[PDB]
Amino acid sequence: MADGGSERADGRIVKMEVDYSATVDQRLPECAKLAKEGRLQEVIETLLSLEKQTRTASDMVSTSRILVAVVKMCYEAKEWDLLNENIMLLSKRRSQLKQAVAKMVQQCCTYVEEITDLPIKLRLIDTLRMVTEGKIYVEIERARLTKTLATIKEQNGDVKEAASILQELQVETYGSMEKKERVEFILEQMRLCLAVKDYIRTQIISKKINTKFFQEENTEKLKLKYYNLMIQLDQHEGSYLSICKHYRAIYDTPCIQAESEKWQQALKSVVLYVILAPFDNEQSDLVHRISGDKKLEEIPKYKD
């Protein structure tokens, strides 16, 4: 009840500054019984969000001192049992997990500078179940991008983390509408396929590239910088004729630049792939479509 969670939520904040987690063992059937009650709209969702919040104060006590992770797996053992008793059938009692687990990845944001890999990956093997099972979120999907990116940064990318992104590419493209950050995650597996050195897997994930259209409007210069990853798709391994739009996007990035060297290799890389591209109707006209620049005729190799 509201007063029944007001007396536990208001009456159990004092004991965290002094006591060991025995009042937390005097909260496991208290959060279990308050969740079995579970006021169906905004009451004990928010009261249990307060009680999981003071549980994260007990995480500042217990899971910030020794990092035992047995205290953690008991805490997500009662989160396991607390996700077990009530259905949550698109039922809306969920802020007990929202800012609780959002503060857990806030804690992991305070852990990656301090923690070793084993208890934080036990936290990750908890929250894989918690978020892929408990009503898939949006912002712990981007914290999923940084937590499986944290598993990448464990060994700085390999075939196993290439599998860890290949299992998480297109799962949450249709549940949560998104245009920016998972698009900044879809650029991440291409170096997880160049470290593998697999051009055809680079073209399978390039089939994953062109399922994300309307690249524009996302931020100011998101995609002008992303075009470096669009040109890394087939840069040195690319063909001679399938590279026209590929060796177009080399040039639109220093179009902002008033430089005369990297914008100059934008010119020379927008003109010397005609030497790549064989006899073409698209050759003999685009050599005069791109002709008209002021700095282009100022190369004797362009005269050549």
CB 167 → another protein: shortest distance, Å? Answer: 17
**CA–CA separation, 197 vs 190, rounded Å?**
10
**Pick from 89, 200, 258, 275: which binds another protein (CB under 8 A)?**
89
Cβ closer to another protein: 97 or 105? 97
**Segment 195 to 254, residues that bind another protein, using CB under 8 A:** 207
275: nearest Cα among 247, 295, 237, 299: 247
CB of residue 211 to another protein, shortest distance in Å: 8
175 binds another protein (CB under 8 A): yes
Nearer to another protein, 15 or 208 (CB): 208
- Provide the CA 166 distance to its chain's centre, in angstroms: 13
| Cα(20)–Cα(223) distance, integer angstroms | 51
As given in the structure block, the two tokens for residue 1 are: 């009840």
Choose the binding region for another protein from 53-61, 86-94, 141-149, 280-288 (rule: CB under 8 A): 86-94
The 26-55 site mask, x for binding another protein (CB under 8 A), equals -------------xxxx-------------
Q: Which stretch binds another protein (CB under 8 A): 65-73, 87-95, 159-167, 216-224?
A: 87-95
The span from the CA of 144 to the CA of 139, in Å, is 8
Using the rule CB under 8 A, which residue among 6, 26, 91, 106 binds another protein?
91
- 47-84: string of b/e by CB count within 10 Å (b at 16+)? bbbbbbbbbbbbbebbbbeebebebbbbbbebbeebbe
Minimum CB separation of residue 151 from another protein in Å reads: 26
Residues 6+ apart with CB under 8 A from 301: 268
> Is residue 16 within 8 Å of residue 54, measured between CB atoms?
yes
Q: Could you say whether residue 174 binds another protein (CB under 8 A)?
A: yes
- Judged by CB under 8 A, the residue of 36, 92, 160, 180 near another protein is 92
Where does this chain bind another protein (CB under 8 A)?
Answer: 39-42, 89-92, 174-175, 207
